[PDB]
Enzyme design. Structure first.
Site, PDB file in Angstrom:
ATOM      1  N   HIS A  41      42.287  41.488  34.190  1.00  0.00           N
ATOM      2  CA  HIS A  41      43.126  42.691  34.173  1.00  0.00           C
ATOM      3  C   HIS A  41      43.780  42.940  35.552  1.00  0.00           C
ATOM      4  CE1 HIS A  41      39.626  45.050  35.752  1.00  0.00           C
ATOM      5  NE2 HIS A  41      40.621  45.764  36.300  1.00  0.00           N
ATOM      6  N   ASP A  84      37.129  39.070  30.637  1.00  0.00           N
ATOM      7  CA  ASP A  84      38.002  39.596  31.712  1.00  0.00           C
ATOM      8  C   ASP A  84      37.878  38.779  33.007  1.00  0.00           C
ATOM      9  OD1 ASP A  84      39.728  41.279  33.086  1.00  0.00           O
ATOM     10  OD2 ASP A  84      38.237  42.899  33.364  1.00  0.00           O
ATOM     11  N   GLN A 177      37.387  51.950  41.040  1.00  0.00           N
ATOM     12  CA  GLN A 177      38.780  51.496  41.097  1.00  0.00           C
ATOM     13  C   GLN A 177      39.037  50.830  42.429  1.00  0.00           C
ATOM     14  OE1 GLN A 177      37.753  54.342  39.111  1.00  0.00           O
ATOM     15  NE2 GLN A 177      38.201  52.522  37.876  1.00  0.00           N
ATOM     16  N   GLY A 178      39.652  49.707  42.414  1.00  0.00           N
ATOM     17  CA  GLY A 178      39.964  48.835  43.494  1.00  0.00           C
ATOM     18  C   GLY A 178      38.921  47.768  43.777  1.00  0.00           C
ATOM     19  N   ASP A 179      37.759  47.875  43.166  1.00  0.00           N
ATOM     20  CA  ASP A 179      36.732  46.856  43.242  1.00  0.00           C
ATOM     21  C   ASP A 179      36.895  45.783  42.179  1.00  0.00           C
ATOM     22  OD1 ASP A 179      35.213  47.885  45.449  1.00  0.00           O
ATOM     23  OD2 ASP A 179      34.289  49.381  44.088  1.00  0.00           O
ATOM     24  N   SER A 180      37.748  46.028  41.170  1.00  0.00           N
ATOM     25  CA  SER A 180      37.878  45.085  40.065  1.00  0.00           C
ATOM     26  C   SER A 180      38.118  43.681  40.583  1.00  0.00           C
ATOM     27  CB  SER A 180      39.026  45.435  39.142  1.00  0.00           C
ATOM     28  OG  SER A 180      38.654  46.558  38.340  1.00  0.00           O
TER      29      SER A 180
END
Length: 224
Positions: A41, A84, A177-180
């Site tokens: 993603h 993912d 959020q931003g660690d994905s």
């Protein structure tokens, strides 16, 4: 990362930060000199020219070695939250040495065991919706949550056999959020997953959900 601590130099030597359009975006794992593993993603559906990887630095803005992308390949069964993972090929090869190394992957067929200790790292927010994101890498240790418990939290169909969960029941420690795309490792320092999704961040009774390297190892090995 919520509830984390500062990473030290030489921690996670394979981790990369991934910017998009010059701003923070996600994390990833350097598999070899020209290959990064991230979450699908993070890259699916976006212009590949927007991305830059940085290796060998605690900072996501400065230091280390950078590369643009030459190609992007998502898992062939990627959809939304499921399967993912993506393989990125680098325009500039990145050698191991110093504070750069390559990841060791969980084996095909493996599945993290409930209650075992895992460590996740990244440059994401430290609160849900956070207004600013750290420059330097953070890490946090959380236990694996059984797939059965995670299915009780999210729904039976929501958690597949290519996902595993980790977190503390009372909350307070998680990726966000931003660690994905960045790494989660087991107690042997083996790469067991990539940060994928969850309901908010560090909430009680909603584990972080991770894409399982063991489950998706055949894809990784094909293209690495």
């Amino acid at each position: 990362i919520v509830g984390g601590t500062s990473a030290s130099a030489g921690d996670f030597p394979f981790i990369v930060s991934i910017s998009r359009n010059g701003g923070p975006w996600c994390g990833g794992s350097l598999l070899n000199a020209n290959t990064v593993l991230t979450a699908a993603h993070c890259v699916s559906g976006y212009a590949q020219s927007g991305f830059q990887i940085r290796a060998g630095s605690l900072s996501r803005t400065s230091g280390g070695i950078t590369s643009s992308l030459s190609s992007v390949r998502v898992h062939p069964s990627y959809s939304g939250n499921n399967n993912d993972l993506a393989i990125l090929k680098l325009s500039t090869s990145i050698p191991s040495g110093g504070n750069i190394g390559y990841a060791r992957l969980a084996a095909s067929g493996s599945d993290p065991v409930a209650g075992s200790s895992a460590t996740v790292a990244g440059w994401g927010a430290t609160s849900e919706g956070g207004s600013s994101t750290p420059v330097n890498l953070l890490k946090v240790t959380v236990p694996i949550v059984s797939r059965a418990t995670c299915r009780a939290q999210y729904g039976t169909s929501a958690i597949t056999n290519q996902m595993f969960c980790a977190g503390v029941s009372s909350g307070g420690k998680d990726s966000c959020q931003g660690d994905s795309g960045g790494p989660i490792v087991d107690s042997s320092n083996t790469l067991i997953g990539a940060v994928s999704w969850g309901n908010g961040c560090a909430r009680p009774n909603y584990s972080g959900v991770y894409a399982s390297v063991g489950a998706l190892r055949s894809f990784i090995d094909t293209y690495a």
